[PDB]
Design a protein around this ligand. Structure first.
Ligand code: RL5
Length: 167
C-alpha cells in the first residue's frame, strides 16, 4: 500500500491521473519524482521548468554542479539527484526531443531507467514540448516499465484521450 490517490489503473504496474506533477509531488513526497530533463539539465520550461520553479531554483543549482563535474547526460540516459522539497530523489531522464531531430527509438531506453526504482511519480517522456506523440509514449511506457509508475498528465483533454484510446 502506498499514498497515491485518484489514479486509474491501466495495467498491473502502470497508473494514470490528471494532475499537476508539482502539486502531486508536494502532497505525496514520493521517493522518486521523474523530471523530463535535457542532456544539459537546463530546466527552462515544460515539466522541468515547473519542477525547478517549485524548488526555488535549487534543482538548477544542484544540476549545474552535476554537469560541471560529469558533463552532459546521454539522450536516453538519466541521473539521480535530490528531490528537494518535492520528493526524496529526482530521477532526471532524457527522452528524445523530436523538435531537435532525436531518434524516437531512444524513448524505450529512456523508460528503462524507471526500472531501477520500485515506485515512481512521472510524466510521459518526450511528450509536451519534447514533441513526441503522447499516445506512443504511453504505449512505450506500458511495454517497457516493470516497476510501479504513477503517471501525471497535466492536460485534461489529453488525459481523457490517453484513457479512451488505451489498448
Ligand atoms: C507556483 C508554481 N508555478 C507553476 N505551477 C505549475 C506550472 C506548470 O507549467 N505545470 C505544467 C508543466 N507540465 C506538467 N506536466 C506536464 C506534462 O507534460 O504532462 C507539463 S508553473
Amino acid at each position: 500500500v502506498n499514498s497515491f490517490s485518484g489514479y486509474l489503473k491501466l495495467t498491473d504496474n502502470v497508473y494514470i491521473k490528471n494532475a499537476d506533477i508539482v502539486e502531486e509531488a508536494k502532497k505525496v513526497k514520493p521517493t522518486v519524482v521523474v523530471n523530463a530533463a535535457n542532456v544539459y539539465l537546463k530546466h527552462g520550461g515544460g515539466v522541468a521548468g515547473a519542477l525547478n520553479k517549485a524548488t526555488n531554483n535549487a534543482m538548477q543549482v544542484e544540476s549545474d554542479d552535476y554537469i560541471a563535474t560529469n558533463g552532459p547526460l546521454k539522450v536516453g540516459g538519466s541521473c539521480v539527484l535530490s528531490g528537494h522539497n518535492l520528493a526524496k530523489h529526482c530521477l532526471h531522464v532524457v527522452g528524445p526531443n523530436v523538435n531537435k531531430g532525436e531518434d524516437i527509438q531512444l524513448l524505450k531506453s529512456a523508460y528503462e531507467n524507471f526500472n531501477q526504482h520500485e515506485v515512481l511519480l512521472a510524466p510521459l517522456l518526450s511528450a509536451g514540448i519534447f514533441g513526441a506523440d503522447p499516445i506512443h509514449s504511453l504505449r512505450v511506457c506500458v511495454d517497457t516499465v516493470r516497476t510501479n509508475v504513477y503517471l501525471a498528465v497535466f492536460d485534461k483533454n489529453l488525459y481523457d484521450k490517453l484513457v479512451s484510446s488505451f489498448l
